[PDB]
Amino acid sequence: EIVLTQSPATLSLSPGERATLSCRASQSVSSYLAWYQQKPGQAPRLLIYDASNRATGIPARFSGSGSGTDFTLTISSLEPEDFAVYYCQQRSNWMFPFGQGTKLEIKRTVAAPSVFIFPPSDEQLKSGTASVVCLLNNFYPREAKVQWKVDNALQSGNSQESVTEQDSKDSTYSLSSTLTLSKADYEKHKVYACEVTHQGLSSPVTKSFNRGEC
Amino acid sequence: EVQLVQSGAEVKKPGESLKISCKGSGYSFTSYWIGWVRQMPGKGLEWMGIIYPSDSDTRYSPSFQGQVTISADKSISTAYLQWSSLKASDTAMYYCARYTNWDAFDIWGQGTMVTVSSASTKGPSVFPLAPSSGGTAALGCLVKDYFPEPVTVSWNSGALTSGVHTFPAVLQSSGLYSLSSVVTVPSSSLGTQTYICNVNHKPSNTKVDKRVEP
């Protein structure tokens, strides 16, 4: 019946820096708290058991501490392989809650996205559907708000986003937002706009088009 | 070497039964509890249940009790997870893990991906994201309505790799996947250079080369 709260949700640091991750239990129990690491595309693996013991083959730079309800995981000096998601876990009688995870991500300087909008193709329109695609390229941090406006009216429930993993060379993210409409609804409106809010831009940036223009 | 090896990826439809396996090696399987953990796409870890292979003493999380059956055949060192009626929301990676008296999952299986959808196998429809201030232009292909994963996308038969971003697929409400693959190129190259996205979908034996023109 306990809840494990991990913080921060995203810890942004660089290789060479010291990392401190937190896990707080809602109630204090007598079971042993463990930490797990999950590298991108891999299964989780045990890092620390009973709050402070390194599991077999875990490097010396990882350590853990805490007692009662407050637990901490520390990496003394980050290596590139340490950028991964970390979860805590502590058994509550016969229930086994996990924390929601902390993503350890590469901090780099702020980079504003380049924004592009693509109208649906005529080949797609012929099939009865219109997908309008908005691209946010090579930005940092990951946090970005993308709002669709059709004839200056805010849209909701008709779009989906996809975000790449952090680029191995420049540490930026890219994001696509796709607005899907039926052909009849697409042709009922004129102006299609994608509005982007990001830390690297002094003001939100909009990319737009008037339907059926060259 | 102590290991847990799980059965291969599965692709099913709602209502179908499914049994996946977890085979222990390099240790006395009968002597350790085995837990099952679910990881839904883009989500964290959730404990489902646990079994002691010696007497098949099984405990489930209240969220999974009566929805799945955990069992073991200690004679062949194998634990199982089964559903009598899969749901679309059962689409997730499933891990088995060995639990120890240190209250931790010290060894994990590699995971079994289970994809549940009402859709049948289907090749993608590929549409252009046509290039239309600045010295840079963006273009791409929208690879829509395919099932199951994965598709691969290359540009100009692998000769164009710089500036390419192929987004992770997003499962649409229809039960079919969709993704875009984009590339940024010098706007001055649009009149001169040919851009073709090569899309391969092995489950349907589909291969499409789409020429993207401005």
Residue numbers in the entry:
A (entry chain L): 1 to 214
B (entry chain H): 1 to 132, 137 to 218
From the publication, what sentences describe this entry?
The selected template antibody was AAL160, an anti-IL1β antibody that was isolated from immunized mice. AAL160 is a well-characterized antibody with good physicochemical attributes. AAL160 binds IL-1β with high specificity and affinity, yet its VH sequence is 99% identical to germline IGHV5-51*0,1 with only one Gly54 to Ser difference, and its KV sequence is 100% identical to germline IGKV3-11*0131. The AAL160 template might represent a middle ground between mature and germline antibody: on one hand it is functional and specific, but on the other hand, some of its CDRs are almost identical to the germline sequence. As such, it may retain some germline properties. The structures of AAL160 and h142 were aligned to identify key residue positions that contribute to IL-17A binding in h142 and are not expected to disrupt the structural integrity upon mutation in AAL160. In order to identify potential epitopes in IL-17A that can be targeted using AAL160 as a template for engineering, we screened the structures of AAL160 and approximately 2500 redundant antibody X-ray structures by docking them into IL-17A using the HexRF method. Notably, both predictions are based on the original sequence and structure of AAL160 that does not bind IL-17A at all, without taking into account mutations that will enable binding to IL-17A.
